[PDB]
């Protein structure tokens, strides 16, 4: 009834000003009431069965004053034959359809915006209506309805052109690569409701984009060109300024939008295609070519910008900037490491220390470009321990960083390796060679054995080790014993831990055994009152008559000081809570250690000692565990047996001037030395009294090449060790106590500290009794800080004692000195004697039945003792 | 009134009595056709103006009358030739039949019946009515391609309900993908030359 009153009023409102009114009726909304209709003149035309040509003719030609109400049970007839379409467009429809369902299913109840929603009649289904209700904010207007109807087609849940664009640009990145068209199906569905006009309109109102015939391809050109222009080459901007966004306010939007696209890693993703689009359009990188590299710290636009700066600096290093462009050399580095492509791809970050550590090496080279010179061995040593190993570090580092740019096969720099290596073989090594010869020529320390101030290796356990008992805690610390170490490990490992706490050190160093190979370094440190060379061992050695090699001998050297030893096969994280017990007298305890020596006399890896500067370096910024203040542990005990070299090419002339008469008692002969009796120096051999300098039971002199010259290449030639100087005999008596373990770490399970007892079995006999936790092995950098929830259990973690919650903060010395009585409360004889029982130490921070060690109790109660 | 379309419509009579129209002076040695894209909903204004122009222009020049939808109605009542070309089946089989039922009104042949209605070459022009009723299969640039078979050198004017960008013709809500160029712009879309009735 009232639907008919409003049908009458709606038809009256159409027929007041249009002679012809449509009414499509697939819903058949007023099928019965057709003649109840009050209209002056109006003729209903059910068009469905009509000759629609002859009824257009009826409407237009035949009856030019007659009013008409057209009807169908479907939409228009096919548009190719829709004679009526021009009328259908310029005229009007009576809405037999009801807006209220749509309005309230949008939320939007609004009987005004109803007329635009009526202009959107073909948009609607319950899904879109209610999704739009999910987005509606009923102070809507036609433009917000438009923007939101865009947003509704676009799948976002806020209606803003940047975010819409982010969606559409997702759909563009799809459409450009991976079998999609819902960008253009969205655009077409926008156009279906006039909204695509509103899209490319509000792309001016918000994004300052226009074109006469726009596409997301053209916008992506114009907008790429914006931040491309803002980051363009300052030497070559203008020729790339001319393909940009339609307005500078759009450029500003586009910069804030591209700053967003960078920062908000939601939408980084569209640079998965811009950097592919944006070369072959103009090849502007090939137009830029020789533009300044270090200034481009600013610009992150493409792979090509980056590769410009690469090749512009590869240029500067085949032009081979020994003479150093220092502050421009710096200008780029950290900025690139922090900038987008670097942040995507670490090998690019490596470029900037392939730079930074060459920036070292060539600054270093410049300041010491004739090699180095100082007045005597003490003043050369003084300068060495400031700096004159940093030329190892820097070369090593930057080559490995260059090679870390190259990590993915990107050899995008290669041949300047051959320049900088020629610095090595043919200059760096080549020169100071001669220079510290002129000092040993000045001094003849050969058989003139004193040097100002600096300490000596020749009597260490006899006159230093037990003299470390000057603080009342001290009698003992654990040793790691290592083969081959270019001294700068023992500056990088410590200086790159100047950041650490009571994990601590002091800048100090001292002079080693003069023949630089492993086992004579070992002998002077084998625990002793005297150091032994003896016949039958040759290049194997002793102290107190016990020897540097063979496992049974190796644990036995130490028994004179209660000790024992363990392999590099075993130390690594050598077995858990039993570590409290196997050791408790041992004034000395040993671990063997060998990664770089296993690259050395392994002659296939001598040419690969830059790969020791990789594989061993990934172990050697690291080392310790088992020491920092907790379950009591105290000091460093490792130091250099010998230094060594590396160089990236076949040798110079200065790399191999050679021997005089080799000694008959050759104790070892080697790639860079010989030990043996009666040898004073020569033009390119240093030769002097090992018997003065070594403190070992040894008559010898030495043969050493003066300068970077060399001998019989046993186990190396580009890697060598043996002779007089500090990439061979700087020994790191840095004051040290603990570090950052990864060296010598792999094979055993974990040893998560050790903790329990000071008892045979964990067996207790007082009515309340001491679990005497013998503090012996802390945390450190693999072993545990874990709070201990200590209680006795059966096999299945079921309680049979009181429980204690335990943690520590101590580093105290002398292994006999260190009990903690965690006094547990005990339950008679509940223990089933056919079954095993244990002290659970929970990880008190996760409280599982985490770990346990063996207990049996059946109390002889207190009165049996007292 | 829209004064811009009323001005452009008054320039039908101005171009007709100016030299270029009846002398065909684009190059002169040409069929002197002309172009008149107009705002698509202004049907009534163009129809009624040309119903008036049939009464007014005989003060100046010689012509006759056409009605756009009447010319179609005079030969069809529905797809019509569809219903008639159903006869093709026995003659050559179902291929020609189906292609002639589906692929309707090839526009070349629109020419002759207007030359039977009006002596086109003897007129200075012909005036249309019903105008933007264009949505059968007849298209503006196609009608302008067809009638040059029979108009001779006599001018024809492409009244079209929509736009012609100086190249792309399009009616109504945006249709067709085609151009016309032998015809001169009677008055273009744009500039003060498109709007010369100030106060």
Residue numbers in the entry:
A (entry chain C): 2 to 867
B (entry chain A): 3 to 201
Quote the study on this structure:
BREX (Bacteriophage Exclusion) systems, identified through shared identity with Pgl (Phage Growth Limitation) systems, are a widespread, highly diverse group of phage defence systems found throughout bacteria and archaea. The varied BREX Types harbour multiple protein subunits (between four and eight) and all encode a conserved putative phosphatase, PglZ, and an equally conserved, putative ATPase, BrxC. In this study, we identified a stable BREX sub-complex of PglZ:BrxB, generated and validated a structural model of that protein complex, and assessed the biochemical activity of PglZ from BREX, revealing it to be a metal-dependent nuclease. PglZ can cleave cyclic oligonucleotides, linear oligonucleotides, plasmid DNA and both non-modified and modified linear phage genomes.
Large scale co-expression and co-purification of His-SUMO-BrxB and PglZ yielded a clean sample of native PglZ:BrxB sub-complexes. The Salmonella PglZ:BrxB sub-complexes were used to perform structural studies through negative stain transmission electron microscopy, followed by cryo-EM. The final model displayed a GSFSC resolution of 4.45 Å, but the features of the resulting map, while clearly indicating the presence of a protein volume and dimensions consistent with a PglZ:BrxB complex, did not provide clearly defined features corresponding to individual secondary structural elements, likely caused by the influence of very strong preferred orientation of the particles, with a corresponding cFAR value reported by orientation diagnostics in CryoSPARC of 0.04. BrxB is itself predicted with high confidence to form a globular protein fold, and further predicted to interact with the N-terminal domain (residues 1–96) of PglZ. Examination of the model using EMBL PISA identified Salmonella BrxB residues R49, N135 and W137, and PglZ residues K58, E62 and D88, as forming the core of the predicted protein–protein interface (inset). The remainder of the PglZ protein is predicted to assume an ‘S’ shape, similar to observed particles from the EM analyses with a central domain (residues 98–292) and a large C-terminal domain (residues 304–748) that contains the metal-binding site identified within PorX, and a final extension including a seven sheet β-barrel (residues 749–867). Alternatively, and due to the observed data in Salmonella and E. coli, we postulate that the role of BrxB might be as a scaffold protein, participating within and allowing connections between multiple BREX components within higher order complexes.
